[PDB]
């Protein structure tokens, strides 16, 4: 088989569509997601073109019987697992191809606002031109969509749209036609509140009870113990995320909280030192100031951080 | 090969059945389960009809390639099913009986609201897309729906395996699609959660309450802080066995509430020490004595409220 | 190809054998094990009879596609076996001798009641479904059932590999099925559990009992709470190596019971401090002295009771 | 099919090119990375030559099976590459232009000496074996070597993708082999190691040094021992992200050295308490005051020495 | 195709060779390693002989399907090898030279007795099953046994790759089997275990011994209990990198013994406090002073005894 010949000099237009059946396994660390979808293709092959004499409105072909464009995905781990569903030819020779495929897609994620982040996942469709003729891709919006039951655990699916204009470019001395299918998602931040955020705030506030205690030994226990629990939360959080060349919102708060523990240790030390030196009136002034300063600076620093990130 | 032609304008009815051989790997975090089953298909193909007398046979056995077979797929699968055709049998009137053994990884959402005292309805959705030649509709042959008695899903009790007899017929890309819903009802075996997570978590909490019979601030700080850290370990342990949910689970609610009890116990321990240092131990004693009753009482009532909201 | 025809009315007997080459990956949590073995099959197909004089050869070698081969499957597998045909030898009378080497991941439930001092009977179920033309039945050729001497299952001792000679013949989806049960008896190597989990867990418990020779409440709180936390770590460690069971395991029972000992030790430490503060140390001393004997004695008797209930 | 015959006695030159589409999964522990790329091949096959005029075609397309194609392999791969032929074009003189898209898991050793401030040269080795008919040699077509601008390797910066133009020709199993070295230069994005591991580890160390402004032995023991345990947690965390090396890494050196600082701080805390108990606090005060300067000073100088030895 | 016929009554000798290209993924817990290698085979097939002067061709290249090839398998593999035929060459006398490149996951038991100062002999067992026509025997062509210089197994030193030249010929299921043993000798790179596990574990133990220069019971309890917990973390860390063994490993022995030292140190700290409370500090002082010498001395001698028993 060979490509359909051009009537004039026009490129062959392959109309495309992707209909999402299943979305699963959005892996934050790997920056991948798995997809199960319908891929629809349409092009004119005049060699395949009478409905009156044939009495048949449509002809069904097997993939091997006809010429089919070599369509690939750019951002996949391995080539897609595809099963042809149907091939239908209209009297004028317009071919309608439908396959169901599954693929693991590589799509970078922006963790800057984590866990209050949104992402635009991409599925890039591509075709390489043949020596005989140039192949160009188009979007049939009537064949772009997603099943209502499509659920991505821990995310809300906003939209699935295609950028209608392909990116046509040369690659290894041939033309290449690339389409961008976009899946907009937003993270379900709910669970982060009772599981990570609030527990982390509770332990921090517990360290601040040391500002109402003169017992150095109890203070050391309060600040050091809670710091260790903060380290456990820091480790827990970093296990759910990849290493980023930037600060994430959570990372910033987690990092800042270390400074609060560090300054609380200095305060607890200074307080004890003065007490030992028979200067408790002064220690009392530092401790009383700390009772206001620590929560106030904590609130303002968080307002500043939320402002820089959102 | 082409589909059986319609005598009038009727849709072709494909009778289906699923017989479960194996159920394994119910992954809570992934919301998947693996299945090994028999898939049975039956439809009328008049072009295959024969006379028993003339042929000298009452049944005809074909190879899948020799005859037309409907393109049946599963909606909620990761990848297409691994299937091996077992038998194809044709009766004199052209009634085809197809049997395949398949294995598949199924995506089926789980409701964790009552975890670990939860029940689930797992779904296996069978689907067929119509052809230009004709419309294909699915039906359930109840005589061919079932499960082996030895089918066990580790950590779960299997209640029933039934099919919703009426298919969901709908248009998808200007073609009729016919969808059947096979339902596997399961209930979680909550037993092990009691000695492994629930009771240990209650023991450490009750141990933090011994601080209400102690005037030693340093010992109290050690009791409340140490047990809080152990509670954090249980919280982490629990969340590793579960996916992130946009709602509160029953266990999650109790785990979260217990933090409030630790937080208030720290305030009490602090207030008690502060008053002692201020030479007002009589007040401190009143707060501590009240706490001995208040903490277990509020804990019990809060748990009755939570169990009520969840069950 | 179609099945061999019956001389009279008898079912077709397919003689089977499994020879284990490798055993690996016994996964306790998954209740699976991987197997690499020879599967031997033998049946008479008179349509393959030949004259050694005419054909030159005394035994014919065939390709699987060239002749009729029974559709033999495993019941308790995750996916269909990975099989490679080693030989298909046909003798003059038409007796087929089929040999394949296969690898498969087998689902076989495990009884954890006596863990880590448990023994198991793993099963490999061979099955054949009957056809319309004729009924197929399985048999065991004991001469072709065995295992390589080098077969080792990491962390287990292999006792025996035998087959239940009588197949289980039954109806399934309006056809006959013939099922054979191959049994691999194994016993767990409990050795490593002693220095890694059991003894460390006993040492920390005995360390908490040193609080019965101390009047220091703050040190006692540190002794009992610290060791309890270490016990939680061991509890977590143990539960990671096991699936969730609707019953108590031997280890689980001991681990759970040890929490009660920590809980009562905290009460004792609290009661002792309370009396000391109330200026009644003579009483506190009587409780502490009694605890020095009571704790180890009750621990020993409770363990004798548990070992008795479990073994 | 057989190799193109030599006009004289020359070896057959196969021109190669690799164009990277995707780079992912650089696994430090495994010392592997996954690659998705275009592999281009070019050679002259006189037997396929044609006249453009009498043919009416300027180029001729063939299926891989129709013509002779060199058996090109990768040396440093886990399994053979997953390849799909994209195009095979033949020009009038019989110059074949082959293009495939492949994916492979590549084994490439990493030097962790300067971790996490390290750079690496990943290798993709292309190989061809000679035939008895003729010697097959590889060449680099620089015009066909490159990478997509969107190529991102999570946690790394990609510097360059170049090929060593001169192949390494050598004998292997009595046939000559022609090997090309494609090099991907990368540098680690060390950013995240600063707020996640480096700074937290420094904070806990500095917190242990507050024991030099405390006379309370019990508080000092708590400060030094608690922070040491947190340092152990960071040590464990770091070693989980790395393979076992027969050398010291930069991070490993700092982590190891910090243990010595904790060990000496414990000795100081012990010596201080011992003297205090012996009624010699003046002395203990001299040791403690010296320690306040000595510990940070020795820490700074030791780090300058280490950075010097490693960079 | 059928096997080459015997000139007299001789078995067919298949000469073998394995050339290692890649060694990776030595998994201690699984007792497996992955291999990528060349497998070379050579046998005489007279039915393929040709005249060198008449033919003009010195060697004839065949496709695997065109000629008879012996069914060579690996005994100790998880699944069948992934193999790609590289070349098939026939010399005038009919000597066949076969070459394939394969990849396989090999099961090979490991002896952990001296871990992490252990050495291993990994095995790759090559096997052939005889045919009815004739017996097939394996031989080693030492000229075709080897390994690439760049072959690196992360965390190990590769010593040698040799083959036991004499095959193990035996009957299995009424046919002869010919087995060859290819041995890869490796020694563990113990370096990293010193700064990561050994030294940190010794530091915490020595820190527990500072309690012998302290009269503070509460500080002593904190020193001994805290370091014991850190020792538990190292015990857990070590056991995660190892499978469960029915014997003691060298590291396991030291780790286990260190628990006894912690246990006795707790007894000493308890006895010391008890005597102090009983107003007998002169005695407590004698026990504490003795402990300062006894603990390090008994530790050193016990380690000399253990090293002696293990090495
Ligand atoms: C501990 C520190 C407290 C953390 C505060 C939550 C972060 C936040 O306030 O996050 C804000 C985001 C909403 O942001 P948005 O619509 O993406 O921003 C787009 C903004 N532009 C377009 C102007 C740039 O989430 C929320 O709905 C917050 C509700 C969760 C509160 C949890 C409190 C506990
Ligand atoms: C601290 C709080 C302790 C938790 C208490 C158990 C939760 C509960 O009471 O759970 C209730 C469920 C039963 O509910 P069901 O059949 O799922 O629902 C049907 C409910 N409707 C239809 C009314 C809505 O489980 C049990 O049998 C409880 C046994 C566990 C006791 C272990 C105690 C320790
Ligand atoms: C904490 C409590 C310690 C646990 C005690 C071991 C349980 C036991 O005594 O286990 C017993 C098993 C052997 O049992 P068997 O052959 O399966 O029983 C068949 C029994 N019938 C036929 C009577 C029903 O192991 C042993 O040889 C004991 C060695 C372990 C000693 C642990 C020392 C620490
Ligand atoms: C306390 C220990 C703190 C860690 C010190 C930083 C390591 C370093 O000094 O790293 C050095 C590398 C750059 O090195 P380069 O180009 O690879 O070396 C080539 C060297 N020759 C050619 C001279 C041999 O990174 C940096 O840009 C440093 C930024 C990190 C600062 C961390 C803050 C804490
Ligand atoms: C704390 C306990 C200290 C552990 C000491 C290492 C054990 C040992 O002494 O190990 C000995 C092995 C060498 O053994 P080999 O040559 O394989 O034995 C073959 C013996 N035959 C053939 C005689 C039977 O390692 C070494 O090179 C020791 C260097 C490591 C020191 C680590 C510092 C701590
Ligand atoms: Cl693709
Ligand atoms: Cl499917
Ligand atoms: Cl099977
Ligand atoms: Cl390759
Ligand atoms: Cl093999
Ligand atoms: Cs085609
Ligand atoms: Cs594929
Ligand atoms: Cs496919
Ligand atoms: Cs829809
Ligand atoms: Cs068909
Ligand atoms: Cs499949
Ligand atoms: Cs299949
Ligand atoms: Cs039924
Ligand atoms: Cs049943
Ligand atoms: Cs239609
Ligand atoms: Cs303490
Ligand atoms: Cs067959
Ligand atoms: Cs299979
Ligand atoms: Cs196979
Ligand atoms: Cs036997
Ligand atoms: Cs045997
Ligand atoms: Cs070819
Ligand atoms: Cs491949
Ligand atoms: Cs392929
Ligand atoms: Cs380039
Ligand atoms: Cs580019
Ligand atoms: Cs040669
Ligand atoms: Cs062959
Ligand atoms: Cs294979
Ligand atoms: Cs292969
Ligand atoms: Cs030789
Ligand atoms: Cs070599």
The CATH number given to whatever domain includes residue B49 is 2.70.170.10
Choose among D247, D252, D241, D193: nearest CA to D29.
D241
**What is the CA(B172)–ligand 14 centre distance, in A?**
8
Q: How many residues does chain A have?
A: 310
**CA–CA separation, E292 vs E309, rounded Å?**
27
| Contact assignment for D173 to E17 by CB distance below 8 Å | yes
Three-state secondary structure string covering chain C? CCCCCCCCCCCEEEEEEEEEEEEEEEECCCCEEEEEEEEEEEEECHHHCCCHHHHCCCCEECCCCCCCCCCEEECCECCCCEEEEEEEEECCCCEEEEEEEEEEEEECCCCCCCCCCCEEEEEEEEEEECCCCCCEEEEECHHHCEECCCCCCCCEEEEEEEEEEEEEEEECCCCEEEEEEEEEEEEECCCCHHHHHHHHHHHHHHHHHHHHHCCCHHHHHHHHHHHHHHHHHHHHHHHHCCCCCCCCCHHHHHHHHHHHHHHHHHHHHHHHHHHHHCCCHHHHHHHHHHHHHHHHHHHHHHHHHHHHHHC
**CA–CA separation, E60 vs A286, rounded Å?**
94
Instruction: Name the closest residue on chain D to residue A263, using Cα atoms.
Output: D207
User: What token pair was written down for E306?
Assistant: 């253990």
Choose among D86, D92, D41, D50: nearest CA to D68.
D41
Which residue CA neighbors atom 12 of ligand 1 most closely?
A116
Nearest by CB to C222, which of E221, E245, E274?
Answer: E221
Mutate to test the pocket of ligand 5, among E115, E193, E203, E311 (most ligand atoms within 8 A of CB): E311
| Contact assignment for B222 to C217 by CB distance below 8 Å | no
Instruction: Name the closest residue on chain C to residue B103, using Cα atoms.
Output: C79
Q: Which atom of ligand 3 is nearest to the CA of C306?
A: 2
Nearest by CB to E277, which of C57, C89, C215?
Answer: C215
Judge if E137 and E203 occupy the same domain. Answer: no
Contact C4, C25 (CB under 8 A): no
Contact E171, E67 (CB under 8 A): no
Last residue of a domain, one of A123, A156, A191: A191
- Distances from the Cα of D119 to the Cα of D151, E92, E174, angstroms: 17, 54, 59
| Contact assignment for A245 to D191 by CB distance below 8 Å | yes
> Which positions in chain C touch B228 (Cβ < 8 Å)?
none
Q: What count of Cα atoms within 13 Å lies in the side-chain half-sphere of residue A49?
A: 6
Which residue CA neighbors atom 20 of ligand 2 most closely?
B311
Judge if C100 and C199 occupy the same domain. Answer: no
Query: Looking at CA atoms only, how far is residue B133 from chain C in angstroms?
Result: 32
Query: By what method was this entry solved?
Result: X-ray
Q: Which subunits count as partners of chain D given 3+ CB pairs below 8 Å?
A: A, E
Q: Which atom of ligand 2 is nearest to the CA of B310?
A: 24
Contact B82, B216 (CB under 8 A): no
Which residue CA neighbors atom 2 of ligand 5 most closely?
E303
| Contact assignment for E203 to D73 by CB distance below 8 Å | no
What is the torsional sign of CA E96, E102, E106, E108?
Answer: positive
| Contact assignment for E243 to C155 by CB distance below 8 Å | yes
Q: How many CB pairs under 8 A join A and D?
A: 116
User: What token pair was written down for B25?
Assistant: 């790997």
Query: Looking at CA atoms only, how far is residue B51 from chain A in angstroms?
Result: 31
Q: Which subunits count as partners of chain E given 3+ CB pairs below 8 Å?
A: C, D
Judge if A264 and A180 occupy the same domain. Answer: no
Residue B310: φ, ψ to 5°: -90, -25
> Which positions in chain A touch D101 (Cβ < 8 Å)?
72, 79
| Contact assignment for D191 to A244 by CB distance below 8 Å | yes
User: What token pair was written down for E234?
Assistant: 């190292």
User: What token pair was written down for E290?
Assistant: 């003795």
Q: Which atom of ligand 4 is nearest to the CA of D250?
A: 7
> Which positions in chain E touch C87 (Cβ < 8 Å)?
129, 131
Judge if E32 and E164 occupy the same domain. Answer: yes
Judge if B168 and B207 occupy the same domain. Answer: no
Last residue of a domain, one of D135, D164, D192: D192
> Which positions in chain E touch D273 (Cβ < 8 Å)?
213-214, 216, 219
**CA–CA separation, B249 vs B265, rounded Å?**
25
Which residue CA neighbors atom 2 of ligand 2 most closely?
B303
| Contact assignment for C244 to B40 by CB distance below 8 Å | no
Judge if A29 and A166 occupy the same domain. Answer: yes
> Which positions in chain B touch C244 (Cβ < 8 Å)?
154-155, 189, 191-193
CB C266 less than 6 A from any atom of ligand 3: no
Task: Give the list of residues 6+ apart from residue B183 with CB closer than 8 angstroms, or none.
Answer: B121, B122, B123, B124, B160, B161, B162, B163, B164
Q: In this structure, which residues have their CB less than 5 angstroms from ion ligand 20?
A: B 174
**CA–CA separation, B258 vs B198, rounded Å?**
12
The CATH code of the domain that includes E276 is: 1.20.58.390
Last residue of a domain, one of B170, B192, B214: B192
- Looking at the CA of B84, name the nearest ligand: 17
Instruction: Name the closest residue on chain A to residue D241, using Cα atoms.
Output: A239
DSSP readout, chain B? --PPPPSSSPPEEEEEEEEEEEEEEEETTTTEEEEEEEEEEEEE-GGG---HHHHT-S-EE--TTTS----EEESSBSS--EEEEEEEEE-TT-EEEEEEEEEEEEE-----TTTTS-EEEEEEEEEEE--SS--EEEEE-GGG-EE-TT---TTEEEEEEEEEEEEEEEESSSSEEEEEEEEEEEEE--TTHIIIIIHHHHHHHHHHGGGGG---HHHHHHHHHHHHHHHHHHHHHHHHTS---SS--HHHHHHHHHHHHHHHHHHHHHHHHHHHHTT-HHHHHHHHHHHHHHHHHHHHHHHHHHHHHH-
Residue A199: φ, ψ to 5°: -55, -40
Contact D24, D154 (CB under 8 A): yes
Contact D295, D261 (CB under 8 A): yes
> Which positions in chain C touch B207 (Cβ < 8 Å)?
225, 228, 263, 266
CB E196 less than 6 A from any atom of ligand 5: no
| Contact assignment for E252 to C196 by CB distance below 8 Å | yes
Query: Looking at CA atoms only, how far is residue E142 from chain D in angstroms?
Result: 11
Judge if C79 and C181 occupy the same domain. Answer: yes
Judge if D94 and D139 occupy the same domain. Answer: yes
Q: In this structure, which residues have their CB less than 5 angstroms from ion ligand 18?
A: B 146
| Contact assignment for B36 to C77 by CB distance below 8 Å | yes
Query: Looking at CA atoms only, how far is residue C58 from chain B in angstroms?
Result: 33
Judge if C92 and C209 occupy the same domain. Answer: no
Q: Which atom of ligand 1 is nearest to the CA of A198?
A: 34
Beta strands in A45-117 (DSSP E): 59-60, 71-73, 81-89, 94-106
**CA–CA separation, D245 vs A161, rounded Å?**
48
Nearest by CB to C226, which of E173, E174, E225?
Answer: E225
Judge if E69 and E205 occupy the same domain. Answer: no
CB E245 less than 6 A from any atom of ligand 5: no
Which residue CA neighbors atom 9 of ligand 1 most closely?
A306
Query: Looking at CA atoms only, how far is residue E175 from chain D in angstroms?
Result: 33
Beta strands in D146-260 (DSSP E): 146-147, 156-171, 176-188
The alpha-helical segments, DSSP class H, found in D133-216 are 193, 199-208
Which residues surround ligand 4 with Cβ inside 6 Å?
D 117, 194, 198, 254, 303, 307, 311
Instruction: Name the closest residue on chain C to residue E227, using Cα atoms.
Output: C226
| Contact assignment for B230 to C228 by CB distance below 8 Å | yes
Query: Looking at CA atoms only, how far is residue D22 from chain E in angstroms?
Result: 24
| Contact assignment for E195 to D256 by CB distance below 8 Å | yes
Q: How far apart are the first and last CA of chain A?
A: 56
CB B247 less than 6 A from any atom of ligand 2: no
How many structural domains does chain D have?
Answer: 2
Judge if A228 and A299 occupy the same domain. Answer: yes
- The SS3 call for residue D139 is strand
Nearest by CB to A198, which of B78, B259, B274?
Answer: B259
> Which positions in chain D touch E237 (Cβ < 8 Å)?
236
Instruction: Name the closest residue on chain D to residue A256, using Cα atoms.
Output: D195
Judge if E215 and E132 occupy the same domain. Answer: no
**Domain that includes residue E296, residue range:** 193-311
């Amino acid at each position: 088989v060979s490509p359909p010949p051009p009537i004039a000099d026009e490129p062959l237009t392959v109309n495309t569509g992707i209909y999402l059946i299943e979305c699963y396994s959005l892996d934050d660390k790997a920056e991948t997601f798995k997809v199960n979808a319908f891929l629809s293709l349409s092009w004119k092959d005049r060699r395949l073109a009478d409905p009156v004499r044939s009495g048949v409105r449509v002809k069904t072909y097997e993939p091997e019987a006809i010429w089919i464009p070599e369509i690939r995905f750019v951002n996949v781990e391995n080539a897609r697992d595809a099963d042809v569903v149907d091939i239908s030819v209209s009297p004028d020779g317009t071919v309608q191809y439908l396959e169901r495929f599954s693929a693991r897609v590589l799509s970078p994620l922006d963790f800057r606002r984590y866990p209050f982040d949104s992402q635009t996942l991409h599925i890039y469709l591509i075709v390489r031109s043949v020596d005989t003729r140039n192949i160009v891709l188009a979007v049939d919006l009537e064949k772009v969509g997603k099943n209502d039951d499509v659920f991505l655990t821990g995310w809300d699916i906003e939209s699935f749209t295609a950028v209608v204009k392909p990116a046509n470019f040369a690659l290894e001395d041939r033309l290449e036609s690339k389409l961008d299918y976009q899946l907009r998602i937003s993270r379900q931040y709910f669970s982060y509140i009772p599981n990570i955020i609030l527990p982390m705030l509770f332990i921090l506030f517990i360290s601040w009870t040391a500002f109402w205690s003169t017992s150095y030994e109890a203070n050391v226990t309060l600040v050091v113990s809670t710091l260790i629990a903060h380290i456990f939360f820091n480790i827990l959080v970093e296990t759910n995320l990849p290493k980023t060349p930037y600060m994430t919102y959570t990372g910033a708060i987690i990092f800042m909280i270390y400074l609060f523990y560090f300054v609380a240790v200095i305060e607890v030390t200074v307080q004890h030192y003065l007490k030992v030196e028979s200067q408790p009136a002064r220690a009392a002034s530092i401790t009383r100031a700390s009772r206001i300063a620590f929560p106030v600076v904590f609130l303002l620093a968080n307002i500043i951080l939320a402002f820089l990130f959102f």
